Amino acid sequence: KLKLSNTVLPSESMKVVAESMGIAQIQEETCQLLTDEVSYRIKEIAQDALKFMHMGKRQKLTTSDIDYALKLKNVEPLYGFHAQEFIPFRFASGGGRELYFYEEKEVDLSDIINTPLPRVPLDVCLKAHWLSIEGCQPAIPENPPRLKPRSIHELSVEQQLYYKEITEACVGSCEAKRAEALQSIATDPGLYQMLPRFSTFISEGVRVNVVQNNLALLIYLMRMVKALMDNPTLYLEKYVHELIPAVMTCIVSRQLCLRPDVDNHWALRDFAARLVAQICKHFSTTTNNIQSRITKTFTKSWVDEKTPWTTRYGSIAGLAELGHDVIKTLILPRLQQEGERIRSVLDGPVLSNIDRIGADHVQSLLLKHCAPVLAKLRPPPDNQDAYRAEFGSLGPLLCSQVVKARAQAALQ
């Protein structure tokens, strides 16, 4: 079965072209005579431009194939203009005209100058790899993918070893190693069918690594989670039920080790954890299961009275990095409680606890979020004392942050 037809250009487009040129009152047989001649020349060239596609070993007809198909038929590749003399440009392709259907048809002549030029890509290089080792295709990233008998593990004896080298490198004794392992996790194509043992090693590790608050052990495991996530080959949402309570624990937990000093890293432990937490709510999303569940736990962490301030700071960060609308709808009715907590830490003399440090970090983070939440939905008028209607927390400094954001927008 083949119902192949002969499609030509419409004749009602050929009369528009003729009467817009000075040739009026053309007959239909005169006009049909134009649209079978030019529809043959389009068919003659597209059949001839398919020769250059096959010879160049491509499956996509590029724009340059018609430039060589035209030159082959002794017609100039120039499309925009036609030179009768033909001497200024002799069968020289000018690359066509970058024109659109939905274009503006008028631009400003300094808009084209002030835009940044695109980056010239890398030059052609020759790398070698292995498709087959004595018949077997390796799983390198340059490749695409009555007694019962004594069973074998679903990993090669060798297979167990990498699990072993990558895990002993990912506990971060040396930083370049850490990276070598990291490189492997982020782009090994054959890292599926080893992923249960990696997820179990992560999950089990954080839970026996918060018994004593060992920050590096945790910062390395969170980097291992981040390296597991951006791998495109492996299927992760079968294992995310172990991954998510591990990261929530990094963000919402108390620190058993020295309270100050590494709190700077602790903020990053909560910074890396809140980054991977909102990346996990970005992916793996179905109706009302993952994002709303972690949002509900973050909000009942917030509205809980008389919290640990480490847990408070971590949950504040976690609810803060959830996107545009989430701080637009959630952080709004709670400024008074935040201010009262700050006032209590300030009044009570107790300085040797971690409450004061937790309070300062929470206030700074909340004030930065409130700044764009404001820069985003209102004009920058009355930036001096109108914020005193919101208890006067960030005030003019918040206004200065909004002004810096406006300057960044102007630079963009």
Partner: peptide
Amino acid sequence: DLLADENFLMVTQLHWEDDIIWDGE
């Protein structure tokens, strides 16, 4: 549609919130 593979993934069938360790000791 309740036999869709996702329904049976244990993220959508497990109270994994209970695992998060808060103030452990």
